[PDB]
Design a protein around this ligand. Structure first.
Ligand code: PRO
Length: 330
């Protein structure tokens, strides 16, 4: 089997991407944030505290002939941005882009934090990290990808995120028309439950490439690129007027600037992030200070190749017995 679904930015800054997912029978279509940095499939639902719902489409298990309460199971998750959600669990039929899994754990939110309530475009998350991170207790549950795997033509999914444009998540096949040149594969560690890999270095604009190992995670659910303070300082030093602002919460730069590109290494390959991708626009409406798309990971504890980096590439998440990550230009 295979699946193929279009993923669409939620706003003009590509803050996140939503992908339609069919849940239950008859289908209830919810727009989920596919997140390679977590392992829970959770939704706004008929159980979500009413005051915490503001425009989202909800899953109503009582209207699904295939929904079953997973008795006694609960879940609770906190994300790197401080947001959180929790609730109970159903099993139901879930389809993404034509690929169907039966008996998928669908985690129904009873409570969500304010950032979720305030984002009316996101009806929940679909986790694509390793199932060892799944938060359901007392019986941990599998991700959609892990449940789908045995039916897939090939044990892979691919992320092809757009810059200010729709893109695609494919399951079970590599679309050889969706990238240019070759795909370069690199080793993954699952020790922390993430798609964790080691970049071979970086360059700023037209500068020389610095060979240096940077361990980090491929995370479609994080907007920005978070790298060591040394690397980030070297980048912003090339932008006149750029500085780190504790009041704003990171690097800002004059909106009149032209940003250099940023290159990261994947083995002997090089992925170039255009300067435009690194511009996240005014810090507040009408400001002439703009927020940077490359930020320090120093306060986070892990480097994160988020959407800023990933949308510059066609990315293969290879979930074979020995997992790997592939990157190609596009
Ligand atoms: O009552 C049940 O089975 C689920 C688990 C606790 C909350 N709701």
């Amino acid at each position: 089997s295979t699946g193929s679904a279009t993923t669409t930015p939620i706003d003009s800054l590509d803050d996140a991407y939503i992908t339609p997912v069919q849940i239950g029978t008859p289908a209830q279509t919810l727009n989920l944030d596919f997140d390679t940095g977590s392992s829970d499939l959770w939704v706004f639902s008929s159980e979500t505290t009413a005051s915490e719902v503001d425009g989202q489409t909800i899953y109503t298990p009582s209207k699904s002939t295939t929904a079953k309460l997973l008795s006694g199971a609960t879940w609770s998750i906190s994300y790197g941005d401080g947001s959180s959600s929790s609730g109970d669990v159903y099993t139901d039929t879930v389809s993404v882009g034509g690929l169907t899994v039966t008996g998928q754990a669908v985690e129904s939110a009873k409570k969500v934090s304010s950032s979720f309530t305030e984002d009316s475009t996101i009806d929940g998350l679909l986790g694509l990290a390793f199932s060892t991170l799944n938060t359901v207790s007392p019986t941990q549950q599998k991700t959609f990808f892990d449940n789908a795997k045995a039916s897939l033509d090939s044990p892979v999914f691919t992320a092809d995120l757009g810059y200010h444009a729709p893109g695609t998540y494919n399951f079970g096949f590599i679309d050889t028309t969706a990238y240019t040149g070759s795909i370069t594969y690199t080793a993954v560690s699952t020790k922390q439950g993430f798609w964790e890999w080691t970049s071979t270095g970086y360059a700023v604009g037209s500068g020389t490439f610095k060979s240096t190992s940077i361990d980090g995670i491929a995370d479609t659910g994080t907007t920005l690129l978070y790298l060591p303070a040394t690397v980030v300082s070297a980048y912003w030093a090339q932008v006149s007027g750029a500085k780190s602002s504790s009041s704003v919460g990171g690097y800002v730069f004059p909106c009149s600037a032209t940003l250099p590109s940023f290159t990261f290494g994947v083995g002997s390959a090089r992925i170039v992030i255009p300067g435009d991708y690194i511009d996240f626009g005014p810090i507040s409406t009408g400001s002439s200070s703009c927020f940077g798309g490359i930020q320090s990971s120093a306060g986070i504890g892990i480097n994160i190749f988020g959407d800023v980096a990933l949308k510059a590439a066609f990315v293969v998440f290879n979930g074979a017995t020995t997992p790997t990550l592939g990157f190609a230009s596009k």
